[PDB]
Amino acid sequence: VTAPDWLADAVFYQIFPERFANADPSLDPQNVVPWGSTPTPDNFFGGDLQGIIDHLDHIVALGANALYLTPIFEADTNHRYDAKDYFSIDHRLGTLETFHALMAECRARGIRIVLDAVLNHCGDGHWAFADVVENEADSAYVNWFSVEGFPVTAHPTPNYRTCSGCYYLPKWNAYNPEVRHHHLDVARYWIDQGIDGWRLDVPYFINHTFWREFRTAVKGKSEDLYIVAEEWRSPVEWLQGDTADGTMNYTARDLILGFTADGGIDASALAAGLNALHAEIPAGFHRGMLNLLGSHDTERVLTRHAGDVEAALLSYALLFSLEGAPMVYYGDEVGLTGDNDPGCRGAMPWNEESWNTRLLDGIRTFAAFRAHQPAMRRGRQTAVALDADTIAIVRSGGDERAAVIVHRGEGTTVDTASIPELAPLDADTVVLGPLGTASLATAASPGSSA
Amino acid sequence: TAPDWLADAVFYQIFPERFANADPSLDPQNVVPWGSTPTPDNFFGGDLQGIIDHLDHIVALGANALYLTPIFEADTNHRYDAKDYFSIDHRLGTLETFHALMAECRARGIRIVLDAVLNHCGDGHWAFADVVENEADSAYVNWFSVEGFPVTAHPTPNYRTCSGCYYLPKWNAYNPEVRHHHLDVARYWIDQGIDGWRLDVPYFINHTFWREFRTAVKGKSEDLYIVAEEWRSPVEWLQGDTADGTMNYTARDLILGFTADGGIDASALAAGLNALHAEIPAGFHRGMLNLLGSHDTERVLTRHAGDVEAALLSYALLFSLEGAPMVYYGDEVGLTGDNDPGCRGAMPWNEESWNTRLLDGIRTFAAFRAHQPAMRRGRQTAVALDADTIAIVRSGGDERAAVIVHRGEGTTVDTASIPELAPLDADTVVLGPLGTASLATA
Numbered sequence: 001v002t003a004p005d006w007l008a009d010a011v012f013y014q015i016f017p018e019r020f021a022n023a024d025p026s027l028d029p030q031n032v033v034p035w036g037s038t039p040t041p042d043n044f045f046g047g048d049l050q051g052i053i054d055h056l057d058h059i060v061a062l063g064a065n066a067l068y069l070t071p072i073f074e075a076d077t078n079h080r081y082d083a084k085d086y087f088s089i090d091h092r093l094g095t096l097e098t099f100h101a102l103m104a105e106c107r108a109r110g111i112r113i114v115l116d117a118v119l120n121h122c123g124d125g126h127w128a129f130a131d132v133v134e135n136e137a138d139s140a141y142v143n144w145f146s147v148e149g150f151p152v153t154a155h156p157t158p159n160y161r162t163c164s165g166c167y168y169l170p171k172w173n174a175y176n177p178e179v180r181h182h183h184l185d186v187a188r189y190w191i192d193q194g195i196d197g198w199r200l201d202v203p204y205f206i207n208h209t210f211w212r213e214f215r216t217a218v219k220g221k222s223e224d225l226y227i228v229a230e231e232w233r234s235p236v237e238w239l240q241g242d243t244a245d246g247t248m249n250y251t252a253r254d255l256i257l258g259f260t261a262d263g264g265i266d267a268s269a270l271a272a273g274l275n276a277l278h279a280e281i282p283a284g285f286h287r288g289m290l291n292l293l294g295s296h297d298t299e300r301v302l303t304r305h306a307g308d309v310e311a312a313l314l315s316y317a318l319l320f321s322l323e324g325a326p327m328v329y330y331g332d333e334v335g336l337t338g339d340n341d342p343g344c345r346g347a348m349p350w351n352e353e354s355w356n357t358r359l360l361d362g363i364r365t366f367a368a369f370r371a372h373q374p375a376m377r378r379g380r381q382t383a384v385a386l387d388a389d390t391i392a393i394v395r396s397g398g399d400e401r402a403a404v405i406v407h408r409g410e411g412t413t414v415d416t417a418s419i420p421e422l423a424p425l426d427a428d429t430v431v432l433g434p435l436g437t438a439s440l441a442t443a444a445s446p447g448s449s450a
Numbered sequence: 451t452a453p454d455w456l457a458d459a460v461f462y463q464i465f466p467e468r469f470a471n472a473d474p475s476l477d478p479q480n481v482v483p484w485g486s487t488p489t490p491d492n493f494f495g496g497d498l499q500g501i502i503d504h505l506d507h508i509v510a511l512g513a514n515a516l517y518l519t520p521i522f523e524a525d526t527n528h529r530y531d532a533k534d535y536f537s538i539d540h541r542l543g544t545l546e547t548f549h550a551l552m553a554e555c556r557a558r559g560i561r562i563v564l565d566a567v568l569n570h571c572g573d574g575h576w577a578f579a580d581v582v583e584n585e586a587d588s589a590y591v592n593w594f595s596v597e598g599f600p601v602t603a604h605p606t607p608n609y610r611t612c613s614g615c616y617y618l619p620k621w622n623a624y625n626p627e628v629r630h631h632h633l634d635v636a637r638y639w640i641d642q643g644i645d646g647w648r649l650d651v652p653y654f655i656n657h658t659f660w661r662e663f664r665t666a667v668k669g670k671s672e673d674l675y676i677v678a679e680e681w682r683s684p685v686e687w688l689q690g691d692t693a694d695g696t697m698n699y700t701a702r703d704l705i706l707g708f709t710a711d712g713g714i715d716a717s718a719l720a721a722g723l724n725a726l727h728a729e730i731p732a733g734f735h736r737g738m739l740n741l742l743g744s745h746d747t748e749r750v751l752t753r754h755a756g757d758v759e760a761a762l763l764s765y766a767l768l769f770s771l772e773g774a775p776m777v778y779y780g781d782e783v784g785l786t787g788d789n790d791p792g793c794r795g796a797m798p799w800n801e802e803s804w805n806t807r808l809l810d811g812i813r814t815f816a817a818f819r820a821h822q823p824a825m826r827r828g829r830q831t832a833v834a835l836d837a838d839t840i841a842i843v844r845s846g847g848d849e850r851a852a853v854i855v856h857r858g859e860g861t862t863v864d865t866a867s868i869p870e871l872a873p874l875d876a877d878t879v880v881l882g883p884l885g886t887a888s889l890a891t892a
């Protein structure tokens with residue numbers, strides 16, 4: 001089966017909930033740092049779920065109708081990939097009630113919620129793992145993990161399987177039916193609590209049999225539940241109809257940034273790469289691709305562009321033009337900067353004198369265009385290099401067409417005649433300024449059903 | 451009628467004391483460093499060789515005509531106090547340098563309009579100094595309006611001047627001898643190769659004189675351009691007997707009202723531009739010299755309080771208009787300054803001190819105009835789409851163009867609603883915050 005239809009109309013906003021908005025400082029830990037502080041692998045700022053709720057207007061005004069939240073279950077770190085209880089919201093984020101309140105406010109606003117499924121590993125603080133450290137071969141949980149022997153040690157190197165050699169992330173034994181049962185109950189439990197899908201953390205470290213079983217458990221609750229795989233390389237293995245509905249499209253990230261920030265690839269090579277990527281994605285999964293320019297595991301877009309906001313805007317035009325659901329990383333829309341993790345996990349400033357609001361408005365415009373034109377959501381995609389510095393992303397539905405034209409040089413003209421996919425447009429020539437974009441579509445009119 | 455070539459023109463205004471100093475041997479002894487604050491009294495040593503040396507800049511902007519502020523021998527840095535109308539100012543160069551500038555301009559297809567300062571001359575001019583000295587016995591006593599002798603500036607001048615200023619004695623244009631001198635100035639520089647004259651404070655003289663002036667200039671050649679300085683309605687100058695057009699200070703005020711001040715909205719801008727258009731007679735639209743700033747105003751970017759994107763809106767509108775657009779030296783690279791003397795800063799030639807994206811934006815608007823024939827000869831219609839959004843539609847014989855300018859936070863334009871454009875265009879077009887879009891259709 002294919003990606004749910006609603007993905008075609010989605011626009012995602014990615015939130016790292018430690019850092020979004022601190023609405024309830026009674027939930028703050030003892031050594032919470034000031035909100036403007038430099039992020040580190042160890043510090044806590046107090047972001048909470050009530051802060052998400054309180055800022056839904058910002059998210060909707062951006063043009064997003066879906067959230068992707070990084071992990072929110074009880075954990076010991078600020079990133080919460082080291083979960084200790086998969087059936088509890090972390091105590092610093094809030095309670096189950098607050099979570100319920102976010103899901104309800106989201107439903108009321110037509111916002112969907114995707115959570116992070118961290119199934120390959122848990123934290124060393126997890127009850128099961130703590131029980132194995134204490135009770136060893138007599139623990140009921142000994143084979144929920146891959147412990148070489150006793151006593152459990154981390155002191156040189158771990159004597160147990162982990163995420164990439166990290167001591168505090170012991171690897172779940174997914175070959176144990178009891179672990180798979182726990183894992184599927186997590187899936188099912190949060191779906192019962194109102195979520196609309198799951199993003200699969202490091203799914204390439206588990207195995208496809210398990211991911212097939214996960215699909216059946218999720219899609220059995222509802223076929224409109226979205227599953228999206230983290231995948232940094234070719235997405236193709238995830239799109240066979242038996243695992244995910246799409247991947248995080250890091251392929252398109254690298255292509256786009258190669259052109260707009262690095263200067264390493266020209267428009268021909270960008271066009272070729274995006275068309276080839278498109279052709280490799282099976283029919284029915286293009287809409288399920290989760291397109292992005294950055295995340296909590298990359299430097300921030302504006303830092304990749306060395307502070308060139310106009311160049312950054314070319315990446316956003318491209319992002320919003322592509323088939324698949326575009327996703328903005330929280331604070332990128334107001335021009336936050338940062339190097340790679342932890343640098344990109346800065347706290348979101350809510351004092352609007354610190355925002356680049358021309359950047360914000362640029363992105364809103366792209367989003368609004370996409371929201372208004374059916375072809376930008378459901379059209380086939382063709383990328384067309386016009387010259388080394390200029391690319392057209394054409395989205396076509398029937399005889400209808402939308403075009404986002406992206407120019408990284410000092411100005412140009414585009415003859416829409418003599419570029420065949422651009423043919424139905426009435427404009428015969430369109431100018432582009434320095435680092436300019438132009439967005440055009442054929443006259444569209446909603447058709448009457450009676 | 452205005453000469454046809456004005457339709458394809460794009461002017462670059464130079465205040466020659468400040469453009470480029472190529473020849474240090476012409477610098478005065480009191481010459482200040484090129485980075486200095488401009489003042490009513492200081493000289494920076496700009497010269498004509500400096501102009502010649504940067505002609506490639508002017509061409510690369512997309513300009514093909516120069517308006518020079520006065521260049522004749524004078525005692526001030528602005529040179530409106532001419533002391534000899536038949537000589538280039540010694541600090542600027544020689545008649546040979548001027549010839550060379552004309553020839554290098556011709557080679558590149560650049561026309562030259564000079565400033566005609568006929569209402570008054572400087573107190574240093576030979577005729578006026580002859581009057582101070584020889585008084586009633588001077589042959590030139592009636593070339594001026596001197597009340598009595600001895601001539602004095604001291605409390606107030608005892609002679610007629612430009613607006614009370616003692617070093618700008620008023621020429622007596624009622625004297626046939628003076629008119630003869632004036633007409634000989636006009637003729638002389640046309641014989642040296644110029645393409646037209648800009649008229650300084652033409653409202654201080656009289657239309658009779660200005661009709662004699664047109665007859666003398668057009669008699670040399672019908673294609674020589676005459677443009678009046680006029681800050682209010684241009685219509686007196688457009689009856690076919692004086693100028694080919696004016697400096698379009700009306701459209702300056704309307705455009706900046708919308709893009710910089712926020713006092714006028716798109717509907718008012720449109721209406722004002724369509725009315726201006728309707729008031730300008732047929733044959734004279736092309737002759738209007740459109741501008742956003744001059745040596746007599748604050749710099750466009752200062753009017754915009756440093757908002758480069760807002761400024762770019764002003765240039766989009768400027769270059770869309772019927773009439774010849776004019777860029778004021780250094781605005782293209784984003785020089786700032788208050789009004790005179792603050793708008794008369796030295797032009798920087800280090801490319802790292804330029805706002806090159808501003809430069810490139812302007813170049814783009816220029817290129818579009820240069821490429822599309824309707825942007826030069828097409829009928830003009832302005833239409834407001836929104837309080838913040840305006841379309842300037844130019845209609846050619848075989849092609850229509852629109853420049854859409856938005857001063858808001860972003861919008862969508864249904865091209866079927868601009869009915870001037872809409873019989874061969876139903877595309878929708880997006881505009882970003884402070885965005886423009888430029889399109890053409892066969």
Ligand SMILES: OC[C@H]1O[C@H](OC[C@H]2O[C@H](O[C@H]3[C@H](O)[C@@H](O)[C@@H](O)O[C@@H]3CO)[C@H](O)[C@@H](O)[C@@H]2O)[C@H](O)[C@@H](O)[C@@H]1O
Nearest residue numbers: 041079081118163164165166169201202230296297341
């Ligand atoms: O192979 C993954 C990584 O494991 C160790 O680093 C621990 C990191 O844990 C988190 O990283 C998650 C990402 O944010 C996810 O989006 C995805 O890639 O999966 C990982 C693990 O769940 C945490 O967010 C990071 O701050 C930690 O560095 C190794 O030390 C790394 O070398 C490995 O690449």
Ligand SMILES: OC[C@H]1O[C@H](OC[C@H]2O[C@H](O[C@H]3[C@H](O)[C@@H](O)[C@@H](O)O[C@@H]3CO)[C@H](O)[C@@H](O)[C@@H]2O)[C@H](O)[C@@H](O)[C@@H]1O
Nearest residue numbers: 528529530567612613614615618650651679745746790
């Ligand atoms: O009436 C005009 C003005 O006269 C006196 O100021 C002397 C100014 O002389 C020059 O200004 C000229 C402009 O730059 C021209 O483009 C046009 O407007 O004509 C005038 C006079 O030839 C000089 O460039 C300026 O720096 C001087 O101020 C009065 O003092 C002013 O109040 C009058 O408005």
Ligand SMILES: OC[C@H]1O[C@H](OC[C@H]2O[C@H](O[C@H]3[C@H](O)[C@@H](O)[C@H](O)O[C@@H]3CO)[C@H](O)[C@@H](O)[C@@H]2O)[C@H](O)[C@@H](O)[C@@H]1O
Nearest residue numbers: 163164201202204205230231232233234297298340341
């Ligand atoms: O998630 C944190 C991490 O993200 C990036 O690294 C991604 C990812 O790269 C490798 O994984 C590859 C697997 O080894 C292959 O078997 C699989 O086919 O393709 C994946 C990627 O899709 C690493 O092996 C893995 O540890 C890591 O998650 C950043 O590059 C990295 O610096 C971050 O630490």
Ligand SMILES: OC[C@H]1O[C@H](OC[C@H]2O[C@H](O[C@H]3[C@H](O)[C@@H](O)[C@H](O)O[C@@H]3CO)[C@H](O)[C@@H](O)[C@@H]2O)[C@H](O)[C@@H](O)[C@@H]1O
Nearest residue numbers: 612613651653654679680681682683745746747789790
């Ligand atoms: O020229 C420098 C000067 O420029 C501006 O002033 C222009 C101009 O304005 C007035 O002239 C008007 C006449 O009085 C009217 O009779 C005529 O119809 O219209 C003109 C305007 O076109 C002043 O009288 C005149 O002295 C001046 O040149 C700036 O406002 C001014 O501050 C500058 O000094």
Ligand SMILES: [Ca+2]
Nearest residue numbers: 473477495497
């Ligand atoms: Ca000099």
